[PDB]
């Protein structure tokens, strides 16, 4: 009884608030794909992804073009819509883009299942709002750069920073870490993430000297999909080893907990499957016990946090800062979900045209 | 912004349609205990729960008019409410009858969720009304009566039926299974379920007799809580072993389904912990690959299974007929749940007042 | 041939001795049910419950009112009785709160019983009277109030003392720790309890500080269901992780023991299931190598540490002081049983009035 | 020193030899991506994509389209290549559409690299051409159907047919089984495929019906991500469990054999990662003792197998058959390697504009 009835898509390259520098160089943009759900209802869901690369943005607007219609007609009931789209895709392989692309569809309807019913993603699933920890997260930026974001952060009123390391040798990285330590003081978080780049013995190594330092936590010390290698890495800690941004739906994050890959877990709004997905992974870390942050997607993840029992932070990363307004507010570094039906998320019309593909 | 205002609840002993027959005795009626959840938008939340026994009724009554306090002037906000009475009860125990009467408060609230929104609870929880097959559940009845009773499902368009079993000797149990086999064809489901009264070597003699039969499953053969004889019983069976209507909240759950106890599961509405408990229960029986049904509270269930994606069966046995509307219907032996907001509860209030304690 | 006449139920609100800090604020009553069993032999047998909170208070003294007619007119054999109640209530859950009520009424049909014989009851249990060291167990006191009471305790003989931590810094709970340390000496117990407040990786960090101070061990870090969480915590440290005052039954306890979630246990002698309870408890606990202490109960747990194998420490905590003659008596820092039949509980019967409900 | 100096990719919807019959209705044309990758050498390297649905295919095709600047003047190197696109895409999720390109190029490099050295890829990965037995794949056919194509298999000297079954009966899988057997009588193989439509208890039922039939293996009973669902099936069975042609990479091949979740494997070669990826396949499944089969692209698959120290069969299953020559042959139900460089594929240039999207 409310139908979808059309999907639109606009492929975007826009411009981060933060550079993001790697051990190749500077990027200075974001491939996203914008997406519009709409329904008979006359409500318009919105959502987007994030492609990672422009290699694969064109790639995954054709597929959500592709894909309309297996769902226009349905009714947008998500949890329904979600299960068709598992077995449509069960022989092509539902994960990486397909995955992607269906989370994509999943969080657009949410958003309109909220708007159909004049309330935000929050209180349909039961819970209220509350203002959640956020800490800022910055890139493989060197000792001066990575000291200046984290000086800027802390003048924000954020009370923890995210940095990736992973230097060619362990002292730059801990010249990274102390020169942030010095600029921020002792009461301040700082997480670190060497983004898979460590073999086991290597992160077990410069992790034992991370953990001396002080840190937060250790993020992904090495390649996503190895959970025993995790698992290894984590048996030789006290400071927990963070993961889960790689996992593509709740089932690789109960592969990932069944084993004891990490004591704690972020699970990213697209990669897990929306909101269905989300909702399923909360209840996988209330059993096994695990704090649960989120993984970009800030806007949708203030509302998720607040329905999951072990919400832990949420990660600020503004990637679609650019064309959307910015609803979302930062108060004395919580994240404050608006007052909007819905997810909150309303484009900013006149900015798209720049940045379309 | 919606918040609670009044908790009313009301102790009932209600006729059963069909008495149930125990080792014991025969008992004509169930005790429950009717629960309405007020709210500042005018909309009142209806849930009920079972007693069991009419020794726990006064007392259950007694602890919810004693936890109104707790959530009147709260937000009806049910996953929020919940964690809320979880803390509140972590010394005393939040399990047993406090656990069940929390499950009372989320599945009215719930109710009155749907209420508010105008939107049957399945909608709400994001998924399609679906018809599910259901199982007409019988009692410790002997030959004859369970015959009839077969036979009597199986001309209201039932294809299952469940009967319980456990006399003193296994020739009767397989007397009792093979005289329905008779009435009903070889085209026709007959659950068996042991109501926890074998050891694990009189459990896996009588089931592997009543696996030769052809039974459907073998449900609770020994004691509910050792998941581990459940375990050691399944792994001498094909036929599957379920349990679950005994599991206080998910993390029992969790426990069982950890060790391998069990290839079916069956939570019940009320002990799992509500709406709320039975998303997550849904969440951990995907994972782990368990085909879920449902434990009395017929009406909620038809919404829930809907929801979950791996729905079984829902087991019809009719507690509350005689105080509530007939809104759920049976067609083809399949639940079909009602266009109405929330769960479909709506009291016989002139039948109500002929059954207070 | 002797058998139970009557069951009569009191509920009480009765001040303490040290009132109660917690995180909301100070409660300065417990809320009790005091149990009278009459039996045919003209004795009288005593015990009493817990409620926790005074929101299960009217229904726990309603349960065990409307459980008398299940125990009057049987023989007063607390083992054949718990078997019977365990049968009785195994579909309701013989669990919560109706696992309390039956521990209540087997707690008093052991002191019936030793009334029956003229022995106290460490005597029936065929072992002698030995002194048991106690700790006095505070509350969530704050630095000065912490010290202050630690420091009477120490006045008092006692040999250690608990405090409960898990303020929102873990620089307050070692504040508080180092404070008592430093007014009561190195040569002092100083047992820490969490209640049960801190995820996993947050106890392990908290725990490994705590264990750098030098505690005697640490209380329920985790929720205390999650016993794979304790044993993860347990797995990062060298003092010892202290659990069991929430396992209701010994079925319980041993599924936590299986898991390795702790090094100390300290059942509860309501929710372990009374007497009955308590000795199946010892029995395991012996087996797994896990020093054994008390929760509460001191009247009866002096008795029972005595008949125990691996017996630790008794926990001071004087609930119903205000109604129960001291017959009790703390010898420097040690329990010291009273010489009069079965457990020693005689009620001020002038003082009972003043806190009736 | 050869480097590659340009990718071009082709679209195509190919009739199939045999349109396959599914749940749904019929499916007549499959969905391909043909590759060529030119090389400084003058070589030019041939492989091909299957897309599974057509939603996939031109968003497959425009993903590789964006994927030729990371390879154009790499060196053909296929295993460096390989480990450069590993890297390249460790944030995207190197896995579904992405992975399955990259095998793309890889299975094209290694047809170049074969040209380049003028010998058959069988020889330049160490081997002798030897023939391989080869079964006759089929669809969801009916009774009838399967018959004649089994009847049709059985004419052209094949040994071994499978059928997919999975219908809403077992008595129905049942009886296509049987009649194929009448039909092609008891010394020949019937391999039979649920393609992941089964819970745990049903595949356990069904397939020890199936069982005491006489089927050679029982493919894929349940969701292919489920490796514990598959390890619980198996062990319920003496039949072989076989599974593989979903994993994507050597990686989940491993973690599916670690848990024993099968006792026969059958890569296919683009999702297990083209040539690089099955040659690491094949010593797992060696050190694992686990039979290897292939799925799917035959004309590679001879080659890869003849070079497998555990092959097993090849499937036949002629996908693009319309579009390239008939170089592989099948000799006495044999598939035989042709005397060609590289893998053997040249295409049918007249017949690929016929079917070009
Ligand atoms: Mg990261
Ligand atoms: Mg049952
Ligand atoms: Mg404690
Ligand atoms: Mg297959």
């Given at each position: 009884?409310?139908?979808?009835?059309?999907?639109?898509?606009?492929?975007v390259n826009v411009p981060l608030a933060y550079p993001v520098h790697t051990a190749v160089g500077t990027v200075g943009t974001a491939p996203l794909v914008l997406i519009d759900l709409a329904t008979?209802?006359?409500?318009?869901?919105?959502?987007?992804?994030?492609?990672?690369?422009?290699?694969?943005?064109?790639?995954?607007?054709?597929?959500?073009?592709?894909?309309?219609?297996?769902?226009?007609?349905?009714?947008?009931?998500?949890?329904?819509?979600?299960?068709?789209?598992?077995?449509?895709?069960?022989?092509?392989?539902?994960?990486?883009?397909?995955?992607?692309?269906?989370?994509?569809?999943?969080?657009?309807?949410?958003?309109?299942?909220?708007?159909?019913?004049?309330?935000?993603?929050?209180?349909?699933?039961?819970?209220?709002?509350?203002?959640?920890?956020?800490?800022?997260?910055?890139?493989?930026?060197?000792?001066?750069?990575?000291?200046?974001?984290?000086?800027?952060?802390?003048?924000?009123?954020?009370?923890?920073?995210?940095?990736?390391?992973?230097?060619?040798?362990?002292?730059?990285?801990?010249?990274?870490?102390?020169?942030?330590?010095?600029?921020?003081?002792?009461?301040?978080?700082?997480?670190?993430?060497?983004?898979?780049?460590?073999?086991?013995?290597?992160?077990?190594?410069?992790?034992?000297?991370?953990?001396?330092?002080?840190?937060?936590?250790?993020?992904?010390?090495?390649?996503?999909?190895?959970?025993?290698?995790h698992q290894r890495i984590q048996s030789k800690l006290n400071v927990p080893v963070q993961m889960g941004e790689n996992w593509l739906g709740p089932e690789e994050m109960f592969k990932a907990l069944?084993?004891?890959?990490?004591?704690?877990?972020?699970?990213?709004?697209?990669?897990?499957?929306?909101?269905?997905?989300?909702?399923?992974?909360?209840?996988?870390?209330?059993?096994?016990?695990?704090?649960?942050?989120?993984?970009?997607?800030?806007?949708?993840?203030?509302?998720?946090?607040?329905?999951?029992?072990?919400?832990?932070?949420?990660?600020?990363?503004?990637?679609?800062?650019?064309?959307?307004?910015?609803?979302?507010?930062?108060?004395?570094?919580?994240?404050?979900?608006?007052?909007?039906?819905?997810?909150?998320?309303?484009?900013?019309?006149?900015?798209?045209?720049?940045?379309?593909?």
């Open positions: 009884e409310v139908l979808i009835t059309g999907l639109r898509t606009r492929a008979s209802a006359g409500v318009v869901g919105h959502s987007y992804l994030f492609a990672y690369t422009p290699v694969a943005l064109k790639s995954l607007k054709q597929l959500l073009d592709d894909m309309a219609a297996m769902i226009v007609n349905e009714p947008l009931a998500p949890v329904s819509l979600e299960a068709m789209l598992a077995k449509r895709f069960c022989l092509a392989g539902y994960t990486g883009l397909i995955r992607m692309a269906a989370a994509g569809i999943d969080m657009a309807a949410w958003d309109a299942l909220g708007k159909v019913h004049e309330t935000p993603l929050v209180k349909l699933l039961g819970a209220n709002a509350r203002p959640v920890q956020a800490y800022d997260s910055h890139s493989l930026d060197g000792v001066k750069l990575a000291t200046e974001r984290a000086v800027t952060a802390a003048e924000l009123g954020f009370r923890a920073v995210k940095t990736k390391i992973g230097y060619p040798a362990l002292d730059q990285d801990l010249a990274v870490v102390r020169s942030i330590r010095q600029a921020v003081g002792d009461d301040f978080g700082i997480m670190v993430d060497y983004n898979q780049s460590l073999d086991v013995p290597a992160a077990i190594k410069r992790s034992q000297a991370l953990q001396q330092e002080g840190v937060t936590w250790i993020e992904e010390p090495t390649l996503q999909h190895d959970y025993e290698g069944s084993i004891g890959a990490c004591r704690l877990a972020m699970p990213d709004a697209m990669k897990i499957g929306g909101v269905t997905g989300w909702i399923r992974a909360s209840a996988l870390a209330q059993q096994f016990g695990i704090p649960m942050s989120s993984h970009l997607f800030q806007e949708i993840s203030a509302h998720l946090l607040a329905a999951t029992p072990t919400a832990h932070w949420l990660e600020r990363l503004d990637l679609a800062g650019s064309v959307i307004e910015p609803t979302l507010t930062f108060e004395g570094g919580n994240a404050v979900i608006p007052d909007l039906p819905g997810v909150g998320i309303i484009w900013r019309e006149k900015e798209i045209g720049k940045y379309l593909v």
